[PDB]
Amino acid sequence: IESIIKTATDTVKSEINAELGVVPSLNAVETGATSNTEPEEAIQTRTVINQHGVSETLVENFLSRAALVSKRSFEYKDHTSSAAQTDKNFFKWTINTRSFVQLRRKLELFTYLRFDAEITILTTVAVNTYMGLPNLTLQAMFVPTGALTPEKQDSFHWQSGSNASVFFKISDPPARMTIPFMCINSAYSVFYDGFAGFEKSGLYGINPADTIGNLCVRIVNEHQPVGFTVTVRVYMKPKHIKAWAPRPPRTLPYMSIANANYKGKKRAPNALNAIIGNRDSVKTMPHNIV
Amino acid sequence: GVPTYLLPGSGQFLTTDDHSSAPVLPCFNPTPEMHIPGQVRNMLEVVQVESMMEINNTESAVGMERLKVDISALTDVDQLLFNIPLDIQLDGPLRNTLVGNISRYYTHWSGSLEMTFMFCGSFMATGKLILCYTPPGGSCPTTRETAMLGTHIVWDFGLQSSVTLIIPWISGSHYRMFNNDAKSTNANVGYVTCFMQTNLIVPSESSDTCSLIGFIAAKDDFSLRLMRDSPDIGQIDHLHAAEAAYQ
């Protein structure tokens, strides 16, 4: 039954027990229920007034940590003889939570998530001699998924009629935006057991309703006579979080961001056929006190 | 105007700060909330669900053979079957559990544990085991005379094929640390050992080697604090197709 739990529960004292018909330490794993044997029923306990709060394991606290989701370095220079596969003073990024594995395993502890995401953008610059670091203006434009993204630094898509842009400088504090809960469903599917199109040639596991959008970031300045290397780090913090149906954590290393494929490490720990590193026997104690 | 002055800590980005920020989409209406089954509001709900221990974390135990302990009929009395190291920080049998994975996001822990053991022999298989918990201090007990002097439960295999060994919170401090020193007095929990109380006695058509499955959950006096990143996941390179999110 649902109740409000602010601290961990208290222990009551117990006595010698010797009753027929009552066996609380015996259980039934086969029902799928966890054992309800209390510590008062297994040993003799004392009264403990437990004042240990439980507020740090709240799902709001467990997930609302600003985590790196994007890291992109591009050369900020005059791009005339640069190849067309490079970032000519701007980049595009489809917003995902799959690329960096600390937030990914943490969000994949749940099947469904409903959250607002606040987005911190940290820009840092390095000289590509030394003459000083420029205080450049960057534009981060939020483009929805599948819409027209800019193809140039100076394209006319950067004018942002209805697309939300943030203009920010390197010497400022980092730019911070709140992106709302933007799914067309009532929760994001962290896992999607399906195909996202009506044909049999779509992608497995990728629901585009889960995708936030594109993040097109340019430098508004023109090129200086020297080049610079600009690294843009994007940080996502979930907030106002509801979470449903928890899952086993991922044990094997991630291979891709598109799928849940697995290889495992070559030896234990976290190998395919051995998640926990090995000991000599089942009656061998690894860190035995001498 | 209002006379102000900036403090130390002005303009910084703490990753754990709790402020309101600018809406990127004004007058946006989120999707109406639907009831979805199984909402988790505290990660201690997850930690109280029993999950299998890899007690058989040995070589020549490949895959699912690590999730069961094979006991047999013995010809000597008072014999040790298995033992379980109780260090949740350290890569032992308790690491890949629901209580073990969520706790490695934290540094301090407190509260009682429970070990559930399900016997998976035949109906014809009889036997009695003793499941001892030893508070820390000395070595792990290797004989049954030594080990039953601590917290134990004697279990006969019958109509209920399961017991629970409550591992009580017996600590000097309020919390225990997930420090690297497993032999520390702030970290070492103690030992769990299993012995033959009588013997595994089967007839000639039961399989002579039977199995246990060990489970561990946390009780509702369990508590975790001081949050850290998990040592269970990590990368030394970008994942596959991560550059294609920029193309």
Add this chain to the structure above:
Amino acid sequence: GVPTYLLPGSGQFLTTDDHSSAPVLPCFNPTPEMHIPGQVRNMLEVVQVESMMEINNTESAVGMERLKVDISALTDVDQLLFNIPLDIQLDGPLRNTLVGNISRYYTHWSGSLEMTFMFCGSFMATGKLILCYTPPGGSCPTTRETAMLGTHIVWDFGLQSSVTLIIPWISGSHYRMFNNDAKSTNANVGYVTCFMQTNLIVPSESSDTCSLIGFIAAKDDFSLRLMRDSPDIGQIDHLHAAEAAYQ
């Protein structure tokens, strides 16, 4: 003074921020408000007005010939006349409509549509049509046996020269996306097809080829969200006389 500290997001210019700024002209008195007819306070007022579909978006249909479908007398039964793709993001018959242009400023949409068809033959022209809506999943239905199994309306041309095919909101999700994948399960709306229920039957002095005009509006359960720039307008250079605004 007041001790303060700057947050992340300080000094930025978001283009969607909602703050008060400095009056360039103090004590300025704006012109008194006059009642002007036809005030729009929500863009869903505009979206509920019917506007013509270019169902005849073919070659050899030049200009205004694209805004009408020419039906004729046929010598076979159950014959397909036209079909309409329902993708509002994609450049089909629904793009240059009042419901189609305002929706391409947005990314998500929900609600019912209505297709109105006005018959523009002679008074002497009789006939019956069936206007079928097919929920998505398979191909577009090409025979009348297949197509009438979904939402349809049978229309006889008489004293009222118009029907409405309500296209119901039949979706799994609350909203549908204006994503580029037209074959996506979050985007594909379905199909509208028209068939001969009987035949277009005219006398010898009516023109033997008659016309329909298709209209589409939104209903009042219609909703749009997540605003974006329209893909319908764009420039690769400055316009003419734009440099003369600097001279």
Add this chain to the structure above:
Amino acid sequence: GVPTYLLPGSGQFLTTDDHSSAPVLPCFNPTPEMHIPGQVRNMLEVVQVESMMEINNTESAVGMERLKVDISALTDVDQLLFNIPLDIQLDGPLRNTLVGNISRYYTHWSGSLEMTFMFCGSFMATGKLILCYTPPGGSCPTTRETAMLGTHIVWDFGLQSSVTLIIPWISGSHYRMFNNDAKSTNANVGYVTCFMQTNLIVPSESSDTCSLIGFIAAKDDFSLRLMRDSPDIGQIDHLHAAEAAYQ
């Protein structure tokens, strides 16, 4: 927005500023408070505890011999035994005391002191001493006729082996400074001298040289202010294993 302006002192880091700062760990629950004996809430609780004076701060007094004064039987009357300089800033007998160490964290001081002397001869040892306090102005008094004209106490050694010389707060100013000039009128406290009132008279089996131990505390009218770093501790290099905290 709110019109603001930054004051002088904006963005500085004063090491004594009293502001609230960002929690590095949100929703952290500290350990419950347990009652621990001997809580100190004001450092004037510590300063009122008597602690030994090194009156024997001479050469050939090695270690613990500095914490006692050896008096003997004399063959002349009115003889000086020891004197105590009362400068608490200056390295004299009062520096390594509980009243002397906490006061060197401060610059100004006020209030009465107490000198307790315990006689540690035998039971058979008799004698009388006079313990004189002289307010400042002139030299330290060297004869007993000169010294008893100030604040004194005459003490016979008997069943109670202790007296207290209250050193009264006799100052022109509210406070006295811990300035380097020990001969200043804002710093010099005066002198304490001890004389034979009669003589130390022992029999032939008592040890002919007996000892005193001097103690000093502060009274409850004592006060310290203007806090500074102590001149009693300091370093010219990093300590051992301090680089290993970076390795």
Add this chain to the structure above:
Amino acid sequence: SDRVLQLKLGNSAIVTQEAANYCCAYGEWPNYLPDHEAVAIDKPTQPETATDRFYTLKSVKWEAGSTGWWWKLPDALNNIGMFGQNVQHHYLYRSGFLIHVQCNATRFHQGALLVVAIPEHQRGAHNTNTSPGFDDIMKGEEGGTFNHPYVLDDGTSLACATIFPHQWINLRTNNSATIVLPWMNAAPMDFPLRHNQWTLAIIPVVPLGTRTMSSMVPITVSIAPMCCEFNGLRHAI
């Protein structure tokens, strides 16, 4: 008392005598879609006893080196009975499921099955970075076989798979498992031919073993849809 159980849905009934207390997933029971959560505006068809009835699949042979079996829902039932005809003639779909798994043997046999229902079991492939295709996922009535059930074929873990709605068939205790599933989706209804809400996984944690005569031991799966709704009537694909 909790060992005997008759489940009566439609014209189908199942009596069992050697059962456990059955599992309702996440404490929830199935229901129809209420009006304050509805999206599709047309009137749904609720065929009830024609579709809310047990559907028994093909049995699987529990053998020596079995790794496990999985069926995806509603994909395992999209071509069976009047459930499959309502699936193929409609665009939308909403139901829960009452899964009953049967496996018995003698009292000289040993073995344990983990019968676990997994929501949104997105699978992974082994030793490749190409995603699984359509035919790897949409098996249908026959279902599939686990390749690496120790990591649940998705890099996670079988040990922590008791966080999902599950039961056990321990052959000395019970011979059946029963899991009642509600609707488990982010959307209120769904297109049944491209998305699976539940995966029934049956996994040999303790293998089958005896020293008596060798009989075939089958594992039978009966699935009853519960509270079926169907919206978006059209032709059949």
Add this chain to the structure above:
Amino acid sequence: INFYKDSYAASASKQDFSQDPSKFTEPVVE
């Protein structure tokens, strides 16, 4: 401190102490 006109702009809501572990630990019906 929330001076924005949208409700999702606000800070994190760390006051949800409602638990129900019995939907995972005792999901059995009797």
Add this chain to the structure above:
Amino acid sequence: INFYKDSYAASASKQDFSQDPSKFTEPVVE
């Protein structure tokens, strides 16, 4: 937050939920 002395200096006024679609959808007189 408006500390300016002119009313037009204020932020955007996003609370005008009055509609009248019938002046475009049913402008007929009967």
Add this chain to the structure above:
Amino acid sequence: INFYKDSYAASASKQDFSQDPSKFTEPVVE
């Protein structure tokens, strides 16, 4: 001035004027 949601974030608490010197100066029992 404390706009943080944690109580330990606050400024220093310089209002504890309770003394008990007798637990150091007179710890004797009679």
